[PDB]
Design an enzyme around this catalytic site. Sequence first.
Site, PDB file in Angstrom:
ATOM      1  N   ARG A  33      65.310 -40.865 -52.118  1.00 20.52           N
ATOM      2  CA  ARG A  33      63.879 -40.701 -52.351  1.00 20.52           C
ATOM      3  C   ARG A  33      63.634 -39.549 -53.319  1.00 20.52           C
ATOM      4  NH1 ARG A  33      58.885 -41.844 -49.789  1.00 20.52           N
ATOM      5  NH2 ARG A  33      57.278 -40.279 -50.266  1.00 20.52           N
ATOM      6  N   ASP A  89      71.485 -38.689 -83.488  1.00 19.57           N
ATOM      7  CA  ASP A  89      71.986 -39.457 -82.353  1.00 19.57           C
ATOM      8  C   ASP A  89      71.006 -40.556 -81.957  1.00 19.57           C
ATOM      9  OD1 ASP A  89      74.370 -38.086 -82.156  1.00 19.57           O
ATOM     10  OD2 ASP A  89      73.624 -36.655 -80.666  1.00 19.57           O
ATOM     11  N   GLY A  90      69.715 -40.262 -82.073  1.00 17.97           N
ATOM     12  CA  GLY A  90      68.684 -41.240 -81.786  1.00 17.97           C
ATOM     13  C   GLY A  90      68.750 -42.401 -82.757  1.00 17.97           C
ATOM     14  N   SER A 140      80.576 -40.641 -72.923  1.00 19.55           N
ATOM     15  CA  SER A 140      80.038 -40.029 -74.133  1.00 19.55           C
ATOM     16  C   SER A 140      78.582 -39.620 -73.940  1.00 19.55           C
ATOM     17  CB  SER A 140      80.158 -40.987 -75.320  1.00 19.55           C
ATOM     18  OG  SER A 140      79.359 -42.139 -75.129  1.00 19.55           O
ATOM     19  N   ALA A 196      74.346 -35.773 -72.897  1.00 20.99           N
ATOM     20  CA  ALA A 196      72.929 -36.014 -73.143  1.00 20.99           C
ATOM     21  C   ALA A 196      72.082 -35.691 -71.913  1.00 20.99           C
ATOM     22  CB  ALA A 196      72.707 -37.456 -73.575  1.00 20.99           C
ATOM     23  N   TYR A 197      71.301 -36.672 -71.469  1.00 18.95           N
ATOM     24  CA  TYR A 197      70.416 -36.516 -70.316  1.00 18.95           C
ATOM     25  C   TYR A 197      71.197 -36.133 -69.062  1.00 18.95           C
ATOM     26  CZ  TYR A 197      66.077 -37.357 -67.707  1.00 18.95           C
ATOM     27  OH  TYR A 197      64.936 -37.217 -66.950  1.00 18.95           O
ATOM     28  N   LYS A 256      73.816 -34.136 -68.659  1.00 16.16           N
ATOM     29  CA  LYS A 256      74.097 -32.709 -68.552  1.00 16.16           C
ATOM     30  C   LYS A 256      72.871 -31.920 -68.105  1.00 16.16           C
ATOM     31  CE  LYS A 256      75.531 -28.662 -71.205  1.00 16.16           C
ATOM     32  NZ  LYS A 256      74.256 -27.977 -70.851  1.00 16.16           N
ATOM     33  N   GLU A 304      73.140 -43.591 -71.305  1.00 20.28           N
ATOM     34  CA  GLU A 304      72.911 -43.740 -69.872  1.00 20.28           C
ATOM     35  C   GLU A 304      71.853 -44.791 -69.554  1.00 20.28           C
ATOM     36  OE1 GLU A 304      71.512 -40.755 -71.475  1.00 20.28           O
ATOM     37  OE2 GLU A 304      69.845 -42.182 -71.556  1.00 20.28           O
TER      38      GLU A 304
HETATM   39  N1  LIG Z   1      65.688 -34.077 -70.796  1.00 18.47           N
HETATM   40  C1  LIG Z   1      66.678 -34.395 -71.626  1.00 18.47           C
HETATM   41  N2  LIG Z   1      67.598 -33.492 -71.987  1.00 18.47           N
HETATM   42  C2  LIG Z   1      68.697 -33.846 -72.910  1.00 18.47           C
HETATM   43  N3  LIG Z   1      68.609 -35.262 -73.332  1.00 18.47           N
HETATM   44  C3  LIG Z   1      67.636 -36.080 -72.904  1.00 18.47           C
HETATM   45  C4  LIG Z   1      66.687 -35.650 -72.065  1.00 18.47           C
HETATM   46  N4  LIG Z   1      65.861 -36.665 -71.812  1.00 18.47           N
HETATM   47  C5  LIG Z   1      66.313 -37.705 -72.499  1.00 18.47           C
HETATM   48  S1  LIG Z   1      65.581 -39.295 -72.512  1.00 18.47           S
HETATM   49  C6  LIG Z   1      64.681 -39.244 -70.919  1.00 18.47           C
HETATM   50  C7  LIG Z   1      63.205 -38.936 -71.175  1.00 18.47           C
HETATM   51  O1  LIG Z   1      62.371 -39.838 -71.236  1.00 18.47           O
HETATM   52  N5  LIG Z   1      62.915 -37.637 -71.323  1.00 18.47           N
HETATM   53  C8  LIG Z   1      61.544 -37.169 -71.575  1.00 18.47           C
HETATM   54  C9  LIG Z   1      61.581 -35.981 -72.541  1.00 18.47           C
HETATM   55  C10 LIG Z   1      62.622 -36.150 -73.445  1.00 18.47           C
HETATM   56  C11 LIG Z   1      62.805 -37.377 -74.073  1.00 18.47           C
HETATM   57  C12 LIG Z   1      63.848 -37.545 -74.978  1.00 18.47           C
HETATM   58  C13 LIG Z   1      64.705 -36.487 -75.254  1.00 18.47           C
HETATM   59  C14 LIG Z   1      64.522 -35.261 -74.626  1.00 18.47           C
HETATM   60 BR1  LIG Z   1      65.681 -33.834 -74.999  1.00 18.47          BR
HETATM   61  C15 LIG Z   1      63.480 -35.093 -73.721  1.00 18.47           C
HETATM   62  N6  LIG Z   1      67.400 -37.362 -73.173  1.00 18.47           N
HETATM   63  C16 LIG Z   1      68.199 -38.238 -74.058  1.00 18.47           C
HETATM   64  O2  LIG Z   1      67.360 -38.768 -75.094  1.00 18.47           O
HETATM   65  C17 LIG Z   1      68.096 -39.892 -75.595  1.00 18.47           C
HETATM   66  C18 LIG Z   1      67.148 -40.829 -76.345  1.00 18.47           C
HETATM   67  O3  LIG Z   1      67.216 -40.556 -77.747  1.00 18.47           O
HETATM   68  C19 LIG Z   1      68.608 -40.585 -74.342  1.00 18.47           C
HETATM   69  O4  LIG Z   1      69.923 -41.104 -74.585  1.00 18.47           O
HETATM   70  C20 LIG Z   1      68.685 -39.470 -73.310  1.00 18.47           C
HETATM   71  O5  LIG Z   1      70.049 -39.281 -72.909  1.00 18.47           O
HETATM   72  N1  LIG Z   2      60.700 -35.748 -56.235  1.00 17.25           N
HETATM   73  C1  LIG Z   2      59.924 -35.150 -55.390  1.00 17.25           C
HETATM   74  N2  LIG Z   2      60.468 -34.603 -54.334  1.00 17.25           N
HETATM   75  C2  LIG Z   2      59.723 -33.922 -53.319  1.00 17.25           C
HETATM   76  N3  LIG Z   2      58.340 -33.943 -53.698  1.00 17.25           N
HETATM   77  C3  LIG Z   2      57.871 -34.518 -54.782  1.00 17.25           C
HETATM   78  C4  LIG Z   2      58.632 -35.132 -55.642  1.00 17.25           C
HETATM   79  N4  LIG Z   2      57.869 -35.590 -56.606  1.00 17.25           N
HETATM   80  C5  LIG Z   2      56.651 -35.246 -56.314  1.00 17.25           C
HETATM   81  S1  LIG Z   2      55.405 -35.549 -57.140  1.00 17.25           S
HETATM   82  C6  LIG Z   2      56.075 -35.729 -58.806  1.00 17.25           C
HETATM   83  C7  LIG Z   2      56.194 -37.194 -59.133  1.00 17.25           C
HETATM   84  O1  LIG Z   2      55.305 -37.809 -59.695  1.00 17.25           O
HETATM   85  N5  LIG Z   2      57.319 -37.743 -58.770  1.00 17.25           N
HETATM   86  C8  LIG Z   2      57.566 -39.155 -58.983  1.00 17.25           C
HETATM   87  C9  LIG Z   2      58.165 -39.813 -57.743  1.00 17.25           C
HETATM   88  C10 LIG Z   2      57.662 -39.315 -56.582  1.00 17.25           C
HETATM   89  C11 LIG Z   2      56.310 -39.225 -56.421  1.00 17.25           C
HETATM   90  C12 LIG Z   2      55.795 -38.723 -55.262  1.00 17.25           C
HETATM   91  C13 LIG Z   2      56.650 -38.314 -54.275  1.00 17.25           C
HETATM   92  C14 LIG Z   2      58.012 -38.403 -54.424  1.00 17.25           C
HETATM   93 BR1  LIG Z   2      59.058 -37.857 -53.136  1.00 17.25          BR
HETATM   94  C15 LIG Z   2      58.514 -38.905 -55.593  1.00 17.25           C
HETATM   95  N6  LIG Z   2      56.642 -34.598 -55.190  1.00 17.25           N
HETATM   96  C16 LIG Z   2      55.596 -33.987 -54.425  1.00 17.25           C
HETATM   97  O2  LIG Z   2      54.733 -35.012 -54.067  1.00 17.25           O
HETATM   98  C17 LIG Z   2      53.455 -34.516 -54.186  1.00 17.25           C
HETATM   99  C18 LIG Z   2      52.762 -35.792 -54.552  1.00 17.25           C
HETATM  100  O3  LIG Z   2      51.883 -36.103 -53.501  1.00 17.25           O
HETATM  101  C19 LIG Z   2      53.479 -33.627 -55.375  1.00 17.25           C
HETATM  102  O4  LIG Z   2      52.616 -32.578 -55.164  1.00 17.25           O
HETATM  103  C20 LIG Z   2      54.826 -33.074 -55.320  1.00 17.25           C
HETATM  104  O5  LIG Z   2      54.699 -31.854 -54.721  1.00 17.25           O
END
Ligand SMILES: Nc1ncnc2c1nc(SCC(=O)NCCc1cccc(Br)c1)n2[C@@H]1O[C@H](CO)[C@@H](O)[C@H]1O
Ligand SMILES: Nc1ncnc2c1nc(SCC(=O)NCCc1cccc(Br)c1)n2[C@@H]1O[C@H](CO)[C@@H](O)[C@H]1O
EC number: 2.7.1.23
Lengths: 253, 260, 263, 260
Positions: free
Chosen positions: C147, C45-46, C157, C161-162, C164, C122
């Site tokens: 936030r 798929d990639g 389609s 992927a991501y 789900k 996506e």
């Molecule tokens: N967690 C996901 N679960 C099921 N599909 C994903 C996910 N994450 C992305 S990309 C988002 C991303 O940067 N994820 C960090 C870790 C990661 C990277 C690529 C693939 C995977 Br699996 C995990 N995908 C799908 O990977 C495709 C790229 O070949 C994209 O179309 C995403 O939908």
């Molecule tokens: N989505 C989160 N929801 C509620 N707490 C979060 C989340 N995300 C982290 S940190 C993980 C991270 O890097 N997220 C990227 C965007 C982000 C960054 C900081 C704060 C927020 Br809000 C979003 N936190 C909490 O913020 C503290 C950072 O000072 C971490 O210890 C998380 O507990």
Amino acid sequence: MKYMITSKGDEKSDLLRLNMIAGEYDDVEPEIVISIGGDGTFLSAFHQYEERLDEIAFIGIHTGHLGFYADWRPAEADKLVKLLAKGEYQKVSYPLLKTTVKYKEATYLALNESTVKSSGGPFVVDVVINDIHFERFRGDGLCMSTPSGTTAYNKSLGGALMHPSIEAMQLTEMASINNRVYRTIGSPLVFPKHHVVSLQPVNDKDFQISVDHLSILHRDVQEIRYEVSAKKIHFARFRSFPFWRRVHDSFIE
Amino acid sequence: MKYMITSKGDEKSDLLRLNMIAGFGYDMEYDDVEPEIVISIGGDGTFLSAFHQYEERLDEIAFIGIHTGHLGFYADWRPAEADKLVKLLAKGEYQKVSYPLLKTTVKYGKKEATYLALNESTVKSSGGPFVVDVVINDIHFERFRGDGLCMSTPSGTTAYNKSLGGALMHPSIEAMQLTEMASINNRVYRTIGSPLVFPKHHVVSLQPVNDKDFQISVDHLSILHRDVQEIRYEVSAKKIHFARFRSFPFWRRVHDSFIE
Amino acid sequence: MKYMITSKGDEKSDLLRLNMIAGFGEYDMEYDDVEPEIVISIGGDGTFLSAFHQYEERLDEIAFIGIHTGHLGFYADWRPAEADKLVKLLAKGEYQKVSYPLLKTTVKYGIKKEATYLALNESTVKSSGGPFVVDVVINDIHFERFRGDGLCMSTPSGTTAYNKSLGGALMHPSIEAMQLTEMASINNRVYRTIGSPLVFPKHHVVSLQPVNDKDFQISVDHLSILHRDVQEIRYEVSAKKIHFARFRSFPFWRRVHDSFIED
Amino acid sequence: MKYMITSKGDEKSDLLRLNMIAGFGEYDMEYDDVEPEIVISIGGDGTFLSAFHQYEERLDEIAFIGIHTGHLGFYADWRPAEADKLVKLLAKGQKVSYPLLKTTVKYKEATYLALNESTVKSSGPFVVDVVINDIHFERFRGDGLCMSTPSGTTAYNKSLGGALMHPSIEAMQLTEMASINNRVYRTIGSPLVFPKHHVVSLQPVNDKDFQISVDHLSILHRDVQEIRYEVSAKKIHFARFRSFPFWRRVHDSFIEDLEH
Ligand SMILES: Nc1ncnc2c1nc(SCC(=O)NCCc1cccc(Br)c1)n2[C@@H]1O[C@H](CO)[C@@H](O)[C@H]1O
Ligand SMILES: Nc1ncnc2c1nc(SCC(=O)NCCc1cccc(Br)c1)n2[C@@H]1O[C@H](CO)[C@@H](O)[C@H]1O
Ligand SMILES: Nc1ncnc2c1nc(SCC(=O)NCCc1cccc(Br)c1)n2[C@@H]1O[C@H](CO)[C@@H](O)[C@H]1O
Ligand SMILES: Nc1ncnc2c1nc(SCC(=O)NCCc1cccc(Br)c1)n2[C@@H]1O[C@H](CO)[C@@H](O)[C@H]1O
């Protein structure tokens, strides 16, 4: 060692029971309760001796699939009967859930969980944590689970799986509308010891309270209180079957 | 006694800081080397910085959080009460409440690195897919694939853990919670889905599969770890200490944050 | 019929590619990686996503075909052993075209000008450091203030992927729509969000507008690039559709069945 | 033309009902409660659901109008204070159609038209096989399954974790209800959206006694052999006068309503 054995009702459960009864039997004053059947059969054995849980060690034998309570294979019974009569065995204590209904109180004990549904219409209550209002719930119902009961109904509702060595209770939502008026936390809530979750009705006051699937249609309910029970269920530990292994074999193959 | 105050950076925090410092001009002396009382002014992130700044002498330091903006779970004291707090701790008339912490161990292939978390410790991939084996007490549990994993402290459950669909825990329960980050349950990589709450003396080991480079973040301090052999999670024996003056229940604080 | 073949780069794909090319040589088939009418993706798929973006300006004059050398993919659904029968059906022209909807992403800056991107799976938007805070404006009307980690708008389609993994719903590719899913929303009283995945029909525009930070990490089909001084990010179902050369009949739900349940 | 008004039950819904009936008598508007061209519901969504099933045999020549006496509803979007304008706009003479769900039960073939959703529970353990277009997909086990309409996604579907779908999309969504996903019973977990002509066949495994509820009209069906789902050709019609977008009603219901 005064013991007592329960049975599901099938031929095998009534046969293997006889194969174990051969190798004192007291159904009124038991110290060793051996459940034969499944997890549901084990629950019935638990509710049969709630008043004397502090003097009874439980053993589960599954004639079917692997259960979180009934784990011993039928072939282990020949070795199970000898080790229990040896006198030497360590117990494993799991926390329990207390359920009080207010109108004169009505206390209940649960090994898995205790759910509160509606008796027809919508389920609208106020969640009060330690005499302090937390949220007003509207939906299907609520579920307060034991640590060991997290792998049951709790998991299906999106609850978190917590190890039974943790003395706490877990509250999970059942299809909350979660809007402006009835804003709910959404996330499951884990309350420690001495924490009391008081469910208070807005209307209706007729709820379907279910303790380990024993669903009673309570009427004229003014308050429902949940808390970590002081009484604990004891398991007779002979071999080594880790909780996370039992979870792995169940859901992860 | 000895004390010190950290600031977020904005004018509201620095001004309120100087206003409180002058208030200790009682038998209180400023010291940022060996303090007995540490005050954080700003937000929860500001409080977390003050935690790691003095994570070498946690067992002799009581922390006090002040939120200049919105309500925090660590910074729960309103600037309007800044006057009363100065006199309150000046007489030393207060109790001590302790919350559990998380220990993170990183082994390579060498030495090893240990980290303490007040909120949570997360492990993601360095770009591509995150594929590891989840080992619980030297026993395999699952093979994870997705974005990453999050091990949260009881007090940190209301942070990133909650947004990831995790369960909320009362910070009196000495435990840790593991939540998934966008897992892909496609029969090849079966995961439990449900959040997992681990008690004390339990070790959750994250063992790599193909790639050995991971982005390990401890309370939003993400640094790249190359050539990782193992990442071990367990409840730390060290505990953070709060200086609660009044009575602000954990669940009440949760209500004011999400329910209101 | 002008055609071309992309390869994953491994031994199996490169080998199968060469033999297929020689197979087409037996018929009226001209190889062309500039103006092809048929595009074959041998890999996964990639690999299929790369082939799509390689020709995202000729999506109308191209019928994509996916071949998976390893595990089954939602795009590459042809087994390598069927490459011989694939040529004989392609050469004759014995096939019909099936179309899947696409997602349009429009980035606006402090006007340097503008940027538009097509997505097969996506399009995600995250922060470049701190928290991700934007106002979700649905059809010129404010819906919520977000936030957290970010937001993910998925194609039908691309729902398998991501989408789900983020708790999104699985949609059948015949449905012309797009699905917005949250990425770790804090969802408190200040930043109250819907929580549920949102499915937007055609001609519906989802506008993401910054609150403080203007630097956003935008990733279209895992092609993540940093956008600075962003003013607005618009989402809508594109008028362009990817075309698949259908020979047999592989159900979308069976592909879901074989991937997430059992096979 | 011909019109009618359905009421909830309380004094509020009845008093407002009489006020409208009077106003329409001053215009050329016939009053029929058996064969109307215009049906007006007063109360809530539940009141509207009754007004749908009460005349689900004449959905072709009926444009529905909803009035909420209490909180804002997705079918009752007109305010009680705007009733005076409503009488005027309806008297002087756009129309919007929403998709409907067709529920077919085979034991005799019973047909049901759902406006919101159609759930299928057991009687204890609910176990069925999910069949999509004459092929196996999964074996479900839990509380039950919920097939919802696009306009019904904001109802029970939203509470079950389902995705919100705009009514312009002719489709149907299937969500799980407390599914126990393990080795034996492995389900998809994710909600499933089906287009037109797509048939979801629910076939029993153990017991044939299932509880089928079409718009809270819970009826216990016996000896069921198959439960089919498909996007009904029948569509419910609405009367449009003022632009009240679907996403607005979603916002004003679950997010906030600052002007109320
Ligand atoms: N967690 C996901 N679960 C099921 N599909 C994903 C996910 N994450 C992305 S990309 C988002 C991303 O940067 N994820 C960090 C870790 C990661 C990277 C690529 C693939 C995977 Br699996 C995990 N995908 C799908 O990977 C495709 C790229 O070949 C994209 O179309 C995403 O939908
Ligand atoms: N989505 C989160 N929801 C509620 N707490 C979060 C989340 N995300 C982290 S940190 C993980 C991270 O890097 N997220 C990227 C965007 C982000 C960054 C900081 C704060 C927020 Br809000 C979003 N936190 C909490 O913020 C503290 C950072 O000072 C971490 O210890 C998380 O507990
Ligand atoms: N938990 C629900 N959340 C948000 N909508 C629901 C829910 N439950 C049903 S109906 C299923 C049911 O009988 N649940 C038992 C408790 C209940 C009953 C009626 C309304 C409510 Br709220 C709760 N609905 C919607 O109620 C409408 C009928 O009045 C149906 O469309 C359901 O979609
Ligand atoms: N869906 C569940 N998933 C995983 N545990 C459950 C579930 N449902 C209950 S009981 C609630 C109920 O009546 N649900 C309707 C359908 C049903 C009934 C019984 C068992 C099952 Br499975 C399904 N349980 C647990 O079964 C335990 C033994 O009776 C009960 O205590 C619930 O904990």
